[PDB]
Design a protein around this ligand. Structure first.
Ligand SMILES: Nc1ncnc2c1ncn2[C@@H]1O[C@H](COP(=O)(O)OP(=O)(O)CP(=O)(O)O)[C@@H](O)[C@H]1O
Ligand SMILES: Nc1ncnc2c1ncn2[C@@H]1O[C@H](COP(=O)(O)OP(=O)(O)CP(=O)(O)O)[C@@H](O)[C@H]1O
Ligand SMILES: [Mg+2]
Ligand SMILES: [Mg+2]
Ligand SMILES: [Mg+2]
Lengths: 209, 132, 210
């Protein structure tokens, strides 16, 4: 079919654009990593070279150099641990704690019962769901005037489904955060649906396993 | 008198450097080396060393999976990781590991944790406990 | 008339949100790779340098062997970071752009530029020549112009990259081995050109094939 050849062109065009955004980010990270770990690694190389040169000539000096190499490597591994943790984004279990604090501070009863917790969700999809969960609850606090908010997070079939419902009143028109959440979920081949009859209920799903 | 140790680490450079660093101790001896979780289960069930040094991410069976299979053996398992990834700590305590340390620990601190583990103590790195 | 302008901001922002997700997807990928490569190699470096210290007196030949491996691992570990850039073209000039921004800010001269306009398909040699010339054009602005503003434009026009460096100071010249002759000689050897306007301050126009 022609529909297939055109979908191939569509996939490739999206891919070309994606590769450019990816590369722009790749260069930014490369600069930050070189800026920080660059000198540290170079110093390690130099001191370990100098230390080798002194093994026989001045073994005490070689030992001093190796103590510094050891220290520098340990502290650099610690910079890396810091970086990797930051790069991995937001964890859904941590976002759950944020929304409990927010709802309690807003005097809205928070109802959550751990059931079917997602076993292996990708870090990216976990970060997207964290963003959406934050926004769904921010909307409850800002607009609903609810006295109760219910959050369910379940692994159902090959999707992670989060439902956020409240007993307040919907304030929007028939047709920002709502478009933002729908766009971010749909980019991840997920979905966002909303019920505005008995308060407001958002159902967000994202593929997983 | 001599602590018999089996080392499970998939990275040969580190597996060899750990064996070299532990064999320098007067009260320790590396009795076997493995690169997978199955290698650890096979040796510990057959040879029964006092201690098993276990990396987490290895092919076939992880060190955490291997630790679960050896939970009710009399071998004291010490886990070694570079990164403290979420759930690793809770799975380690549920599997009953006696130590959970960082690979980059100085040899002095690693040998000390092996002696404490042999004294019945549980040695967990504060970095690795998922509350700072 | 103005509901088109307000509709294009929704389009720009929606594209931006999607871009942020692709950026984050890449960020997570690099984070896994770092953990696997760099993380492993740093743990090894720490261990081998510890073992090597333990062997200084016991077996100095073995300590030397360990230190050769530590040296190699550290060098390759820096090359991994250097490699995760994906050996891009456009870097040298992008790094010189950062140098001149720091230099002009330190000299209290306003720097006017736009990063969205820096050619990528330029040869590494011609990129290095333009970096040299851009450095010197800005060094001259700082040293001689007494300008309060410096404007740099970098444009891909036809089959040339054209860089213009202008300032609002005053030209102080009326020579052999100095920057102006040097830039002109180097550019001309690469089949490029250097032109100068000294009426409203000083404006250099350098072009190089691409
Ligand atoms: N849980 C909820 N309860 C009641 N009304 C809600 C609601 N969530 C959203 N709304 C309504 O829908 C409108 C659109 O929500 P949206 O999240 O897109 O923007 P916003 O008004 O919260 C500002 P921003 O999203 O940038 O923080 C809100 O202004 C409000 O009237
Ligand atoms: N941007 C600028 N504004 C004002 N005067 C400038 C200028 N660029 C150059 N000039 C003038 O032209 C002269 C020649 O510049 P040129 O770059 O060749 O040598 P120089 O004086 O900067 C030493 P060198 O180039 O080795 O650093 C300068 O001495 C100065 O009087
Ligand atoms: Mg909102
Ligand atoms: Mg490993
Ligand atoms: Mg000059």
């Amino acid at each position: 079919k022609e529909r297939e050849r055109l979908e191939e062109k569509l996939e490739d065009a999206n891919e070309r654009i994606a590769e450019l955004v990816k590369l722009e980010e790749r260069q930014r990270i490369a600069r930050d990593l070189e800026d920080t770990l660059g000198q540290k690694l170079s110093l390690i190389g130099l001191k370990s070279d100098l230390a080798r040169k002194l093994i026989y000539k001045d073994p005490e000096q070689a030992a001093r150099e190796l103590k510094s190499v050891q220290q520098t490597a340990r502290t650099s591994l610690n910079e890396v641990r810091k970086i990797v943790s930051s790069m991995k984004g937001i964890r859904l279990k941590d976002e759950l704690i944020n929304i409990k604090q927010i709802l309690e501070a807003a005097d809205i009863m928070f109802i959550y019962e751990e059931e079917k917790w997602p076993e292996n969700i990708s870090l990216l999809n976990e970060n997207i769901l964290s963003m959406c969960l934050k926004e769904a609850v921010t909307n409850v606090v800002k607009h609903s005037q609810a006295k109760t908010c219910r959050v369910d997070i379940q692994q159902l079939w090959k999707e992670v489904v989060i439902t956020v419902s409240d007993d307040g009143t919907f304030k929007g028109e028939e047709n920002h955060g709502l478009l933002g959440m729908r766009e971010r979920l749909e980019f991840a081949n997920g979905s966002l649906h909303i019920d505005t009859e008995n308060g407001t209920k958002l159902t967000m799903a994202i593929p997983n396993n | 008198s001599m602590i018999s140790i089996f080392i499970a680490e998939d990275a040969q450079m580190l597996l060899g450097a750990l064996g070299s660093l532990l064999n320098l101790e007067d009260d320790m001896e590396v009795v076997g080396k493995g690169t997978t979780g199955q290698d650890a289960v096979d040796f510990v069930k057959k040879r029964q060393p006092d201690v098993c040094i276990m990396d987490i991410e290895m092919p076939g069976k992880t060190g955490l999976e291997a630790a679960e299979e050896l939970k009710d053996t009399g071998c004291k398992i010490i886990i070694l990781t570079t990164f403290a990834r979420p759930g690793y700590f809770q799975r380690a305590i549920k599997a009953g590991v006696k130590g959970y340390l960082l690979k980059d620990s100085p040899s002095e601190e690693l040998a000390n944790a092996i002696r404490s583990v042999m004294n019945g103590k549980r040695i967990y790195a504060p970095e690795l406990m998922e509350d700072l």
